Subunit: 209 residues, 3 copies
């Protein structure tokens, strides 16, 4: 019928991950990538990196709308992410695979992204656990920044300096939306300042708690 999230789809027999249309709070249809395999399944994937084929060094407008390909890398769009997390309580999961096939993850108790008027402010709950480490520690309430709209608290333009949009505060390292390095490689996710971690694949996803 009118699935409201990937969890509803999973309950309806959809055991394989894939794209499906779900209906947002205002019933706006949105085709999203459902992770039906990982940690119970029913996760709506809003970010995916895997080979650096997609340019993520985009402006505010692009991140607002979303960009990329369903066949590969993408950013679902901030308005969409806000819409997906505005209702109820949602948990955040970050799934990563290093360049040797090791899967690692990080999970957060609650995750919400405010609307554009609030600069897509990140409302992040407690770090639940995960082999990947808590790279988003202290990021609760950080506003979103893109190369053309610096809403971070650093003297440098974080989004430019780390070539990517994120919920920056006082930036010191690149993140999952940074440049996909080739020949550190891929993208970074580290909980320890001064130490980078290279991942080939990244997926940020949400599911009602």
């Amino acid at each position: 019928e009118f699935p409201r999230n990937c969890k509803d789809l999973l309950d309806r027999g959809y055991f394989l991950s894939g794209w499906h249309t779900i209906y947002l709070p205002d019933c706006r249809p949105l085709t999203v990538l459902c992770d039906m395999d990982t940690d119970g399944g029913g996760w709506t994937v809003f970010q995916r990196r895997m080979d650096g084929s997609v340019d993520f060094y985009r402006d505010w407008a692009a991140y607002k709308q979303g960009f990329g390909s369903q066949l590969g890398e993408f950013w679902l769009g901030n308005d969409n992410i806000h819409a997906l997390t505005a209702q109820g309580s949602s948990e955040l999961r970050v799934d990563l695979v290093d360049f040797e096939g090791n899967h690692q993850f990080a999970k957060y108790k609650s995750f919400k992204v405010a609307d554009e008027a609030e600069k897509y402010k990140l409302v992040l709950g407690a770090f639940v656990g995960g082999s990947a480490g808590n790279s988003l520690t202290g990021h609760n309430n950080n506003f979103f920044s893109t190369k053309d709209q610096d809403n971070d608290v650093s003297s440098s333009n974080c989004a430019e300096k780390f070539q990517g949009a994120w919920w920056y505060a006082d930036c010191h390292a690149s993140n999952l939306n940074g440049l996909y390095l080739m020949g550190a490689n891929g993208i970074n996710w580290s909980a320890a300042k001064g130490y980078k971690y290279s991942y080939k694949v990244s997926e940020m996803k949400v599911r009602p708690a």
Copy 2:
């Protein structure tokens, strides 16, 4: 459409995911191979990079798991449903690490219902450059690490890390660990034996069926 063959006849010339309806009319999105050996094949297993964990339990293999964007096991209940009626042929398409396509084709293929433990009902091997690795596997029950149904004293699924229609296992199979060996051409990816004592490594595998 009740299968990919109906879709092919319907004009769907490109391989890809489409919805079909099992006998009970319950919809199921399946990967159709419309290119290989005349097209119309319904793919129930696909491996390509070892991104998906195939060391799963009976419940997992029963329902199916993985991703439409990559590796997956369509699900034994689904596979049974797809092969329960009439006669279906089985095709296994592999690609080694040097890009060479190899295959194995069987005259008839069917997976029994869960009641009969998804027993493999395999007809005659009709040829294929990949060799007949399923030789003498007909009537074998399906075994997963948690649901042991082979005719051995050991739990084959565990020893070779992977669910399969084991009898008395000897080597790994298409559902085993996707190895990352030091050598790319051999002892890498997944195994399918061309003949007895001669194992070969494959980077990609697809198991598919088509009504005969």
Copy 3:
């Protein structure tokens, strides 16, 4: 209602992906929409990326289309003609070399005639692109396959360069040639190729 990827883009489909559009004869066709590159709304009719698909096929194969939505494909000459038979359409060729460098070639006008006209190439001016005009001087050329030689060269161009294309008097391989230099060639070897159209 959507007649092409531009219609889909305009209706909220911002991510590239496969969607159903309706051709002039109203028959549905699932096509790959590039919603990202150069304004988006491009209908991709050819894609190469790893050499997994055999492109050395006959007239019938190229006429209907072949390949996989999950990878490499040729949408089909009848479909390409159908997609460009009305109004004016732009052609874009997006390529990626073996190091990740994206390059492109863009043409102001592009159309593939019907089968009676041997899917003749109707190509407008080269609007630009980092990849250079490799289709230079191919306007009005017929499409040729290994079993249907419609070129002007004494030899069988499609066979000689193992791939179907709008050959004149062949001299090199093209985007529909053997995927090996590695990969495919465009007047330079590339790992990924996408040919796409959008109404102008």
